[PDB]
Amino acid sequence: PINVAIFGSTGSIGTNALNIIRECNKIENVFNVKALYVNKSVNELYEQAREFLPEYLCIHDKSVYEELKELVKNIKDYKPIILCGDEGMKEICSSNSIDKIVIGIDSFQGLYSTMYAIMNNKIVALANKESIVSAGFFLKKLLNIHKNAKIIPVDSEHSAIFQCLDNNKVLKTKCLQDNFSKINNINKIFLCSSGGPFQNLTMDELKNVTSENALKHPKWKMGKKITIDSATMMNKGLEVIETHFLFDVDYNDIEVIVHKECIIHSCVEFIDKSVISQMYYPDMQIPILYSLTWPDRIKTNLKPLDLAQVSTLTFHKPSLEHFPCIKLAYQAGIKGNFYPTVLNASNEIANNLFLNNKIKYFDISSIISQVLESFNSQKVSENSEDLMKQILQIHSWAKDKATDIYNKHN
Amino acid sequence: PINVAIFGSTGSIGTNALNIIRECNKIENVFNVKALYVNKSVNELYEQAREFLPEYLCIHDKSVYEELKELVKNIKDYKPIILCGDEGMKEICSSNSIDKIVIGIDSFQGLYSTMYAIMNNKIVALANKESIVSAGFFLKKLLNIHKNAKIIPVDSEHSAIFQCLDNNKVLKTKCLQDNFSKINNINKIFLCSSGGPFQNLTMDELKNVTSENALKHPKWKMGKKITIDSATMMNKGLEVIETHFLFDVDYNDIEVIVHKECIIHSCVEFIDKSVISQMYYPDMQIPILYSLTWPDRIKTNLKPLDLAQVSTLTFHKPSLEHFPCIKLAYQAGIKGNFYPTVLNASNEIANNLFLNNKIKYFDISSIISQVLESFNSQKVSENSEDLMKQILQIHSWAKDKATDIYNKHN
Numbered sequence A, B: 001p002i003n004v005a006i007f008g009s010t011g012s013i014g015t016n017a018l019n020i021i022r023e024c025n026k027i028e029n030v031f032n033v034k035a036l037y038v039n040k041s042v043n044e045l046y047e048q049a050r051e052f053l054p055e056y057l058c059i060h061d062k063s064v065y066e067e068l069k070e071l072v073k074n075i076k077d078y079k080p081i082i083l084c085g086d087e088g089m090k091e092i093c094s095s096n097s098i099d100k101i102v103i104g105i106d107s108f109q110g111l112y113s114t115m116y117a118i119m120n121n122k123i124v125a126l127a128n129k130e131s132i133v134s135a136g137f138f139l140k141k142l143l144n145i146h147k148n149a150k151i152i153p154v155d156s157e158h159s160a161i162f163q164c165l166d167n168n169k170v171l172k173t174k175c176l177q178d179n180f181s182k183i184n185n186i187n188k189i190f191l192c193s194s195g196g197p198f199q200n201l202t203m204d205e206l207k208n209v210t211s212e213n214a215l216k217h218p219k220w221k222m223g224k225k226i227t228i229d230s231a232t233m234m235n236k237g238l239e240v241i242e243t244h245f246l247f248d249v250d251y252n253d254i255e256v257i258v259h260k261e262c263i264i265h266s267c268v269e270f271i272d273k274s275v276i277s278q279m280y281y282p283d284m285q286i287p288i289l290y291s292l293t294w295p296d297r298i299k300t301n302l303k304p305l306d307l308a309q310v311s312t313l314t315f316h317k318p319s320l321e322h323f324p325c326i327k328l329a330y331q332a333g334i335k336g337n338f339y340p341t342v343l344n345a346s347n348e349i350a351n352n353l354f355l356n357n358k359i360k361y362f363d364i365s366s367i368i369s370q371v372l373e374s375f376n377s378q379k380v381s382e383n384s385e386d387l388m389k390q391i392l393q394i395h396s397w398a399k400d401k402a403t404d405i406y407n408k409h410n
């Protein structure tokens, strides 16, 4: 019986997590949903509580706390512990009844909850790539202290890589640890990308693309921020750094490859040169489920992959001239220090400016480049609390710098 | 140090095994070649002995024993144990200085040394699919007696399947053991085929194909017998039965798929519907090496897979009208009993008749079908020695029956 908490239970990751839990539990009772946590979606939380009957309920916005307490009286034979805010989140993380926590929260409230799950030696199913990019060294330090805590990757490509590894080796180590790649005999990673909507466009066409071109009738329905990052390939740039931190793979041994069918989710080359890959239809339920069943697998009723129907799988190298965000991500990763923090923060600003029609496509990369060029390496604090404060300071500095560059140009 | 014996060391599997051993040992001294066994290729064995300096040499043909003794006197600082025939093979199998035995002896004959390797509780790297098809239930019985013996598959597709599995699960079972697929969470197998030289021919074109057409300017240089089996797709038919026995996968859960690029070597669908595949250039060194390093991997200097250069991977369903041998193999497998023994034996004859221009393409499947129809199931012996005698008797009966059908129609 797997006891699971879901943080951000009404977002995309949270609802896909509950969907696969529901469907798997029909086949065999495997999961007990112990806690649900949302920002302010009190009615959606009530609907989930009605079905899943968790021991804990938490809502971040305290203005809707009483509104939740009244609604929950409608559910029969049910007396949950209803909590509020950061203190509620912390009480859930500290509960002995919870084994695994799904983090479906974007940005730094995601990092904050991840931190407390780790301090409580839980398994943390983590989808938030920006938290790993911006606080990777901090998370490594925290995981070295809290020896039974584990991050299990949910980002589709990183789940794929993790699924391609031998658990007889994985169990000797854990993600976001030094020497992970040595212990697992990993030589190199093929990190698969959809390529986004702009692969066939010329440099002159890219000059004029808008956020509407990136968002309009998309091949893959996703959130706006990640859709823009897919269009610039900065999504893959961030995922290169995510790969480096999760699996301790050198940047020279991570290759971005454009695979437009999105059936192969990534591939691992081992030291003998044998390559293992993971494949499925594009569907977050498989990566989410594996994060909750690892090191085992369980039965689902998902549609089986029909390779004959798929028929063709294609691969090509991305053009760094057309997708300069990729090069910027490698440069930041290789420089190390807090350059990944700076990359992520400046991209947060540049992405949103492009989304709102304030800058052009190549201005995204120009702004990010200028902020990276302005940053000077800082001595990394040995003290965990000071290190988190450095990450926050540098994140804020980089956002401000990106905004200042935009303001001067405008 | 991994202590290895190579049986049939001058054949294709044996020479590829020594090639990858040589290249891996240059990087780090990991293998000791303890024994080499050949039928009669005395000069080739001498050359291998000069390089690898094995403790044991064995030659099957007693008429070249004295010649081998005199040749070996030329090698400096070297006093091997020089043995002959079946007795020498048995002595090598019983040596406490040998851990792993590569069986590179073809056809029904390779079963004999495989049996003795298992009786001595060795790890047996088995390439010979005909042995597994013709004596599958016998090998299962023998492996249940000799608890510490293991068969590790070398046939490229079966190595691929094995490499796709989690060794944390594999180590709790073994190939040819009941419940192997359940313990490994296997749902279904995609068994990849090149499709062979006749894959795109029309029915009218197929009727006229000759063995010269199959053997001329081949895409892949291989032995004549397997090349004919690739042309008829009986190679994959045999490999379906091999999959069933090795991994305890139901015939309804094995799908043959034509993958003409021969980069993906096969794929495993797990019970959650996630699919894992193994990939490399067509090269027997990877399957052979994995059989000798399992459950670990070691460094090689093999060419890394360039997926962007490969560019395209394709998949389609084979036509059973054009490749009726596939249907015959599934039918024989599903019937069980000694039908696989009969399939293999009758195919041995039909393959050779077509090779030597005595029958046409569709006569191959006609002969096999008629022999299968003629066979009457026998009560399966409980005693392992009686069971082996039964397999031998049925093998001989089926060859003679195939020949008799040919003689009638000729």
Ligand SMILES: CN(O)C(=O)C[C@@H](CCCc1cccc2ccccc12)CP(=O)(O)O
Pocket: A155, A156, A157, A192, A193, A194, A195, A196, A220, A221, A222, A226, A229, A230, A231, A233, A235, A236, A262, A265, A281, A282, A283, A284
């Ligand atoms: C899904 N995922 O982890 C992404 O990063 C988005 C990525 C893959 C999109 C295709 C895809 C792949 C796997 C699962 C998906 C689930 C929902 C929607 C899309 C899915 C876009 P990119 O490669 O161009 O950077």
Ligand SMILES: CN(O)C(=O)C[C@@H](CCCc1cccc2ccccc12)CP(=O)(O)O
Pocket: B155, B156, B157, B192, B193, B194, B195, B196, B220, B221, B222, B226, B229, B230, B231, B233, B235, B236, B262, B281, B282, B283, B284
């Ligand atoms: C290699 N192997 O295990 C075969 O059964 C031959 C098979 C695959 C041939 C391609 C291939 C695949 C993998 C390794 C190879 C090594 C040498 C030559 C060819 C290799 C032909 P088929 O699929 O049409 O039945």
Ligand SMILES: [Mn+2]
Pocket: A155, A156, A157, A239
């Ligand atoms: Mn991703």
Ligand SMILES: [Mn+2]
Pocket: B155, B156, B157, B239
């Ligand atoms: Mn094969």
